[PDB]
Structure 1
Amino acid sequence: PIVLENGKLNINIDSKTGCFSVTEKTSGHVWKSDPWENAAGLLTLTDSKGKKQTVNISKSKKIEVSKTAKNTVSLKFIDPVFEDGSVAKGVSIATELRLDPNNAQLDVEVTEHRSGNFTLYDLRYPARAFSLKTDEDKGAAVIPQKQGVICPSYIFPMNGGRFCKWDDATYNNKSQGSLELFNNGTGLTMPWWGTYNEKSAVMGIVDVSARPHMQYNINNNGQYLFNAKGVMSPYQRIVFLDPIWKLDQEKGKMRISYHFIPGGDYVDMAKVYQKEAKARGHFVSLQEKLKRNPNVNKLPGAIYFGIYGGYPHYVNMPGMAFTFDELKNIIKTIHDDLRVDKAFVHAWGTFSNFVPHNYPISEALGGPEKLKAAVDLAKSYGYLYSSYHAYSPMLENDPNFTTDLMQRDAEGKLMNTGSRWARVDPKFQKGLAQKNIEKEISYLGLEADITDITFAAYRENGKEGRIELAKYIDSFNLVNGTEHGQEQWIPYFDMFEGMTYLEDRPLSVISHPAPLFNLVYHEAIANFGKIQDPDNEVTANGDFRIKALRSMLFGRGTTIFFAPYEFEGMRPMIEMARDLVSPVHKETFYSELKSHEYLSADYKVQRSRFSSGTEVIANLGPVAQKIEGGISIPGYGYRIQMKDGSLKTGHFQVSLHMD
């Protein structure tokens, strides 16, 4: 066995298989290689017949493991063997393990692959590494899926219905699969993931040039590997997260940097990535944004109101569209009657053309002077205001629809025919914004802007055009927001609408929300709830009680998103957000979310500490539970220590009024 060792880690590499273990010498915890098959890696490739197979590369005909520098071990896997015993002659995978001389850090890189006459597809490398043994390790996988989740490595008490779904999912396909980086759907928002137990933590950070996928296995014993053969899995239930290198498309450096943290958990992992986030240039603080634009200080304590008039989906839809006088009266009511001191008013439906032609201000809704009266009233309150804007859609029902501005692929076929909100090639979007946005800014005296869709993901195709648009919008120095966001866009915006949770998502029944993204970026980007899952709707992610409490724990702002006819029914939730969430949001807005903790065995009682001197404890479940010192937190209750020394305690109550 070949050893790399420094003061902090011992890497033990098996010369027969290329598998390796990592001893974290402070805690003494040992991370084992693949517990199931002793596979260093899992390679998907075509056979002689053109059929895809997945093979254990530790079964290759020749495996060469040599110490090639003081702290580098080079590995080569030559001529893998298929299930029938034929050989993939001429195929090979070369990798390197590089131990930092001083730090508890191990770089792992796929340096070369050779396909011969076959075709190489997925490579899981390292395979089923850094795993947790279910119900032996008491820890979790840590996955930055949108705002982020943890997946405990053991079964624990919880509501009976939740428990049945949770345990069942660890025995079927719900607990295995893969996610991608930097999308606004099911995927990851930061290029890292990790595992920890009560002794030690490990996380891996993906090279900035690479786009592996992430395979997950959450307490599953691998029965999914055996269902087609109709036999029972012989393997043990474990938790692992693996990189999937897409050998058929990846042109970047296939490197992942593992960082080992004695006694660490998901908080420590997030703080390690926060250093890398700064080095990558993503981290531009809200304090720096405020120095550039004093109006950023209209955001702390603001409720984000989306008044949804059926636009962009329809122009002047009966029963949905608001007139500009109606918009003014909603703003007046929010301030004068509901006493909301700070607000971001976002009016969806102010133009008489379909996006991406964001003009003119609609005559049918009252015309420019009446919109200006509404915006002026909002400004007189100190509120931020934006219309709905988008430069990416090309909509079937728009009389101006054309395919002129849609992108085509190499075969001349239209792209995004299945995604109507993202059809305009980004290389045209700055020019579309230039058609009217300066006119609207000048006429309405705008202080703010929100732009939809374009910055919800960070994909390679079209990135240059998106950057051009972001730089143009940023050049106006408005308080500005965008849908969902990604870390790469943080330099250009003050707020993201979203970066919370999908309602239906892989892992939903076997994970707990954890504020991973905000543990990294709360000081750099403000976030609010998503308009599809706002704080006034009851969804898989909770009702108002749960969402208000989670908002304060995670450091996000309230979103109230409604059709005009619903407005009277929003009043009680606006008042509760005003009294409970808004003062905490205001106090914590610029601060670091220093720590988050789960304080109850069912993960429903949680404690967040912010560098404003604010501590938020809340109980997201129905039953009162005790914490340290015999302090009781009511069901749907909170205990919040403010910087001014006051202690806010209380809880939500549902009551039945029988007349």
Structure 2
Amino acid sequence: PIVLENGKLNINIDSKTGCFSVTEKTSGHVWKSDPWENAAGLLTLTDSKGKKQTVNISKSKKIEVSKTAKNTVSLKFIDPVFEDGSVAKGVSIATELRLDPNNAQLDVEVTEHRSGNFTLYDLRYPARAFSLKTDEDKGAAVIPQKQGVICPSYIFPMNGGRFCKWDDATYNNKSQGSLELFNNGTGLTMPWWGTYNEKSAVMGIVDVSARPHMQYNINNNGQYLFNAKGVMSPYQRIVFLDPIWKLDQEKGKMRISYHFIPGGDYVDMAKVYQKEAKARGHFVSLQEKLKRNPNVNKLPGAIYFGIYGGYPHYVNMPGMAFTFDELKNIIKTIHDDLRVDKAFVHAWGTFSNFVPHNYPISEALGGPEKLKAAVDLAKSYGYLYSSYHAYSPMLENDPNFTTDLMQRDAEGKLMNTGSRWARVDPKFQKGLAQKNIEKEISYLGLEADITDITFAAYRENGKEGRIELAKYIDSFNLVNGTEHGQEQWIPYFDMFEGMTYLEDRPLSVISHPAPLFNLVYHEAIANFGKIQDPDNEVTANGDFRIKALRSMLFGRGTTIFFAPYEFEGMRPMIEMARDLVSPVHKETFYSELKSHEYLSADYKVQRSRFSSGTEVIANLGPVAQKIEGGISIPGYGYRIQMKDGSLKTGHFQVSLHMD
């Protein structure tokens, strides 16, 4: 067995299979290779008949493992063997394992692949590596799915209903699949993932040029590999996360950089990636943004209000649209009656054309002067204001609809026929914004802007047009936000609307929310709840009690998103956000989220520490629970140490008012 070793790590590479283990020498923990099949990698390719098959590349006809430098092992997998005994002659995979001379870091790279007369697709490499043994290792997989989750590697006490769904998912297909990088759906928002137990942690950072997918397996024994054969899996329940290199489309460097952290967990992983985020240029702190624009300080302690008038979906929809006088009175009530000191007012429905023509200010809703009177009132309060804007949609029900600004593929067919909100080719979107945004800014004296959709993901197609639009919006130096966001867009915005959680998502029944994105980026980008899942709606992600406490733990601001007719029903939640969340949000806004901890066995009691000197403890479950020192945290309760030495304690209560 070929060995790479420095002071912190030892890489044990098998000469016959190419599998490797990693001994983390400070703790002594050994990361084993594939526990199921001893597979260095899993390669999906066509056979002689043309059918797709997945093969174990350690079963290849020739395997060359040679120590090639002081700290480099080169591997070559030549002529894989199919299930029927036939050979994929002329197919080869070349890889490299490169140990850092000093640090506990191992680069893994697929350097070459040859197809011969076959077609290569997915390669899991390394396969089923860095796994945790279910109910023996007491740790978790760490997955930055949107704001982020952890997936414990062992069964633990929890509500009986949750428990049944949790355990069942680890035995069926809910616990296996793949996610993609940098989308606003089910996918990841940072190019890393990891696993840890009580002794040691490992996380892998994907090369900036590459777009692998991430395979997950959360305590599943691999029964999904045997269902079609109708036999029982012979494998052990394990947790692993694998890169999936898309060999049929990947043009970048197929490299992942593994970092090994004695005693680390998801916090330590996030702080490792934070260094790489700064080196990649994503990290532009809110302090620098405030130096450039003093109005950024209107955001700490601000509640984000979305007044949804049925727009952009419909123009002046009866029963949904607000007039500008109605908008002005909502603003006045929020300040004068509800005593809200700071706010971002976002008015969905101020123009009489459909997006992407964000003009004119609608005559039917009252006209420009009445809109200016509403914005002027908000500004007199120190509130931020923006209309709803989007430059990406092309809507069927728009009388101005045309396919002119839509993109066509190489066969001349329209793209995004299935995504009505993202149909305008990004190379046109700056031009569309230029039609009226400067006129609205100067007429209303705008201090703020929110632009929706265009920056919710970071895909390659159209990226140049999106950067052009981001640079243009940024040149105005407004306090500005965008829907969802991604790390690549952080330099151009002050806040992201979202970057929290989908309601229905893979892993939802077998994961806990963890503030992974904010552990990296809280100093750099402010985030608020998503308008589809606001703090006033009861969803899979919780009611107001749960969402307000999670807001303070994770460091995001409150989102109240409502149709006008709902407004009277919003008042109690606005008041509670005002009294509880707003002061914590304000104090912690610019700070680093230094640490996050789960303090109860059911993961419902949690503790977050911010570099402003603020400590948030909250209990997101119904029963009181004790933490160290015998302190009790009430159900749906909190214990918050503020910078000024005050201790905020309390809890939410649901009461029945029988007349």
The TM-score range, normalised by the shorter chain, is over 0.9
Report the secondary structure of 2:518's partner residue: helix
Moved over 4 A (4+): none
Provide the rounded CA distance (Å) in 1 between the counterparts of 2:540 and 2:565.
24
Provide the rounded CA distance (Å) in 2 between the counterparts of 1:149 and 1:420.
30
Q: Deviations over 1:236-290 (max 9, x none)?
A: 0000000000000000000000000000000000000000000000000000000
Provide the rounded CA distance (Å) in 1 between the counterparts of 2:428 and 2:487.
23
Q: Which residue of 1 aligns with 2:275?
A: 275
Cα offset, 1:304, TM superposition: 0.1
Cα offset, 1:202, TM superposition: 0.1
Provide the rounded CA distance (Å) in 1 between the counterparts of 2:2 and 2:202.
21
Q: Deviations over 1:321-349 (max 9, x none)?
A: 00000000000000000000000000000
Cα offset, 1:601, TM superposition: 0.1
Provide the rounded CA distance (Å) in 2 between the counterparts of 1:432 and 1:34.
52
Q: Which residue of 2 aligns with 1:425?
A: 425
Provide the rounded CA distance (Å) in 1 between the counterparts of 2:113 and 2:415.
31
Q: Deviations over 1:472-509 (max 9, x none)?
A: 00000000000000000000000000000000000000
Report the secondary structure of 1:480's partner residue: strand
Give the 5 Å matches for 1:131-280.
131-280=131-280
Provide the rounded CA distance (Å) in 1 between the counterparts of 2:399 and 2:64.
65
Q: Which residue of 1 aligns with 2:540?
A: 540
Provide the rounded CA distance (Å) in 1 between the counterparts of 2:240 and 2:402.
47
**Does 2:652 match 1:652?**
yes
Provide the rounded CA distance (Å) in 2 between the counterparts of 1:523 and 1:85.
56
Provide the rounded CA distance (Å) in 1 between the counterparts of 2:229 and 2:144.
34
Report the secondary structure of 1:22's partner residue: strand
Provide the rounded CA distance (Å) in 1 between the counterparts of 2:608 and 2:350.
40
Provide the rounded CA distance (Å) in 1 between the counterparts of 2:145 and 2:418.
24
Report the secondary structure of 1:438's partner residue: helix
Q: Deviations over 1:9-55 (max 9, x none)?
A: 00000000000000000000000000000000000000000000000
Q: Deviations over 1:63-105 (max 9, x none)?
A: 0000000000000000000000000000000000000000000
Q: Which residue of 1 aligns with 2:27?
A: 27
Report the secondary structure of 1:645's partner residue: coil
Provide the rounded CA distance (Å) in 1 between the counterparts of 2:435 and 2:70.
60
Report the identity percentage.
100
Q: Deviations over 1:390-430 (max 9, x none)?
A: 00000000000000000000000000000000000000000
Q: Deviations over 1:345-387 (max 9, x none)?
A: 0000000000000000000000000000000000000000000
Report the secondary structure of 2:421's partner residue: helix
Q: Deviations over 1:123-147 (max 9, x none)?
A: 0000000000000000000000000
RMSD: 0.1
Cα offset, 1:154, TM superposition: 0.0
Cα offset, 1:166, TM superposition: 0.1
Q: Deviations over 1:593-633 (max 9, x none)?
A: 00000000000000000000000000000000000000000
Which structure 2 residue ranges, 5 or more long, are not aligned?
Answer: none
Which structure 1 residue ranges, 5 or more long, are not aligned?
Answer: none
Provide the rounded CA distance (Å) in 2 between the counterparts of 1:158 and 1:627.
17
Provide the rounded CA distance (Å) in 2 between the counterparts of 1:16 and 1:258.
23
Q: Deviations over 1:151-204 (max 9, x none)?
A: 000000000000000000000000000000000000000000000000000000
TM-score by length of 1: 1.00
Cα offset, 1:542, TM superposition: 0.0
Report the secondary structure of 2:435's partner residue: helix
Cα offset, 1:574, TM superposition: 0.1
Report the secondary structure of 1:422's partner residue: coil
Report the secondary structure of 2:388's partner residue: strand
Provide the rounded CA distance (Å) in 1 between the counterparts of 2:611 and 2:339.
28
Provide the rounded CA distance (Å) in 2 between the counterparts of 1:61 and 1:365.
74
Cα offset, 1:449, TM superposition: 0.1
Report the secondary structure of 1:270's partner residue: helix
Report the secondary structure of 2:48's partner residue: coil
Provide the rounded CA distance (Å) in 2 between the counterparts of 1:119 and 1:377.
64
